[model samples]
Target: MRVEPLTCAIGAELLGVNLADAVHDDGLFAEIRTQLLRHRVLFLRDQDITRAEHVAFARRFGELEDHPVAGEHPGLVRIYKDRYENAWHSDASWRVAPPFGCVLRCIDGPPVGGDTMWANMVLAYENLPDHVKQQIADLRARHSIEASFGAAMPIDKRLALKAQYPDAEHPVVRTHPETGEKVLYVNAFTTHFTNFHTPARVRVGQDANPGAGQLLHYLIGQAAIPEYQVRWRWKKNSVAIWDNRATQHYAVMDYPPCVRRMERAGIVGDVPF
Candidate 1:
């Protein structure tokens, strides 16, 4: 198999390997995982595999998890085209464990103008200003499903959803479990900082008074830096596998009203420190 990087920031394409067969090959799967860790995202073309095969390949990393607010086929999430409303987010960030990674298969797509983008969080953190890094070294932020996905639901349903999933409090800079690198963890799911008060930066009133909102927005905005991003255009039978713990992804909704179908299997992950 040939491993070719798609960009300086994130994606790599694995040529000459069939993913359906790779799921059952331990050595090949290990190589793919290694490449995934290095590239943050890996893409494959013409992988006309079955649902069972997609789930099996993703399960090699860990058990698959379902999204609370979205419909699924057991472990696979079917992403259908809507009015182009999706934004940049790490899947299930409101969960206590979030997700380790995800494998997405494009079964169908628009004739034109639909693509996805990924940003390396580790790179985002590494490129931050020294003062900004120091400011967020000990900060934690709140990630809520109610504030995001459940926001449009009815009041009772939204309240119930929050009771079930609740808000997840995670470090602003979390260490990657496998690579030991710090990652800028907050994204669109993040509400605000839980521990925003500091003696050096604060002669303040409350949590939001000490530049917490602005600081959180700044940290979250790091993912938008072009140097830390890679964009991919999809084709039928194409697949993308990414480490959710190390990166943030956006589903570009530029396509007009059309059917762009995708199925994803998400692996369960550990709590961020």
Candidate 2:
């Protein structure tokens, strides 16, 4: 139950929390959730728990999602080894309801490099200029998994993937259901604004270029602000669970030729309002 703050803006590391113990302890898990909201991301060292125990603790919050690509474990995804990407994004925002949160276990790491950074979108939203905030207040955007994850596949298979999971149009600034805070929601998965094309933002000459696309480009890079981020160097048996709706993460794929092994379980979330 010892909560250590990693940064003032975003992350906290829990010292006394054992995931195996938290699985059956409802009160402890409640405190964990409360701290999760306050800190946005909770980190812990020495999570020598099994995959079954890992799923059990995450399941306490909600049901876990089955990733598009299945593997050895039912609720576990061996990322870094499989889901290869290095971008700032909220996990599975392409889904109508993206992940509620993610439990990430760093099974192994290299001597140096292979770091991951998490950004507080709530903080990013709050720091926006008044005019920018007002402009995106009611806007929505389309997030597509087809363009991100399915790009390597053949045209036929990629189209089928898109057909399976259609573009999910979500608020450009989503309200955090639990905290009542606004989240700057666009990410790498986002293609363009679904509702920013209007008379207010576009005219005969304006519609030709600027406005919508430029606005999206601006919002998407907000996650790259280092002030709102906390970068964690991976270590064996260390783990973190982050609220996906309010935070975005980027993987550093610069580990020379070494392996950056990680296991993850993503809890399902309700549809964005």
Candidate 3:
């Protein structure tokens, strides 16, 4: 297999190898897995595989899980352009154990203006100022589905969902379990810092104003930086597989009103440290 870097910061396209081959080929799968860690995200073209094949290939990594809200076909979840996923985020970070990675296939989509962008959270953490890093080193924040997907649901239903999956608290800078790298864990799913005040950072009433809120916003906003991102234009039968553990992604919603269908299978992951 040949690997082509999509950008200096993230994403690489694998050429001359079909993903299906990796389902049973240990050596080939090992190479692909290595490339995935090195690039954070992988893109492939001309893979007109079946839904079963898609699920089988993704299973090479681990078990797949269904989304709480999105519609699914067996192991695959169909996502339309009209959805609220346009914002930048790591998939299912609200879960105690968010997805390890996602394998997405473009079933049908617009002719133009619908592209996906992924940002390297590890790169975002590395580039942070020393003072900012020191401040957030031991901090943890709350992540909730209630403030996002459940926002449009009825009050009772929303509250029930919140009760089922209470807010998850995660480190502001988490150690990547696989690579031992630091990652900026907060993103769109993050509501507020659970432990933001420290004797060194917070003084008096400042904790209510710019202390917690401002710092949280600044850290979460790191995913928006372009230098740490890669944009991919989708085509029918094209696929993108990304590591949700160390990256955040945004789905572009700029296309005209039309069908933009994508099927995604996400691998179950361990809880953040």
Candidate 4:
């Protein structure tokens, strides 16, 4: 298979490989790991991968964790990332250690604006100044299901979220299991910092001021390096594999009431050491 870079640091498109058949080749799996490390995400188009094939391909990288076990998707979930304004995040970041990577297979999507954008946390961290990076290196952040899967509408809608996903916490910085690189591990979807019981806010007296919009904006700014991000347009019969441990992603919720369907398989990941 030939690999072409899609952006300076974030994405790559792999040509001439059939996901259905590629799983049987040992060399291809090794090569895929290399490409994933270099680009953070790898895409294959015009693939006729079945649900079984998608699961099989993911297992080649790592064992599969049942979605229900992880409290991620619901029962027998196929990960249908619809056009409901999905946020940028690694799956189940509230866990002490998140999944290694995810294998997403495109079944169908809208003609336009269903693309997904990824931010390279490795590049995001590398771009920070030494002092700033050091200050947050030992810091840990919390992740809440309420941050991403929670509700913001009528009481009924909010009730459903409370019944479905509860809150959980994680670190502010995480290590890429494959590359051993540190990454900034927070997002706009992040609910709050774990320390000091401070609500989202600006800093006051070297401590955070509750409800500081500017402080939150400043933290989000650290993850906004343009060169470290790229968007991928989805096509039918395509699969995208990414290392979630060192990256953050957002779904561009621009499509109207169109129905888009995608199936995902996540590779098991170790604790980022």
lDDT of 4 by residue, 71-189 (tens): 22322235454423366676677555567888887788777778888889888878877866655665565666554555555777766765565555555676665567877777755
Report the C-alpha lDDT of model 2 over 19-103, residue by residue, as the tens digit: 8898988899999999999999999989999999988888887888975674456778886543445899998899999989989
Best by TM-score: 3
| Per-model tally of clashing residue pairs | 0, 0, 0, 5
- Cα deviation of 104, candidate 2, in Å: 1.0
What's the lDDT for all of these models?
Answer: 0.87, 0.88, 0.89, 0.71
On a 0 to 1 TM-score scale, where does candidate 1 land against the true structure? 0.94
Per-residue CA lDDT of model 1 for 134-231, tens digit only, reads: 88898998999998878888999999999999899999899999999899999999999888877776775654564788888888888888889998
User: Least accurate stretch of 10 residues (summed lDDT) in model 1?
Assistant: 79-88
Residue 168, model 3, lDDT: 95
1-273: candidate 3 lDDT, tens digit per residue: 899998999999999988888888999999999999989999999997888889999988898885565662566887775466788898889989888998999998777978999999999999999999888898898899999989999999999999999999988888999999999999999999877766777678776566789888888888888999999999999999999999999988787788778888989999899
Superposed model 1: Cα runs more than 4 Å off: 66-73, 82-85, 206-210
Model 3 earns a TM-score of: 0.95
Say which candidate scores most in lDDT.
3
Candidate closer to the true structure by lDDT (higher is better), 3 or 4: 3
Specify the poorest-scoring 10-residue window by lDDT in model 4.
Answer: 70-79
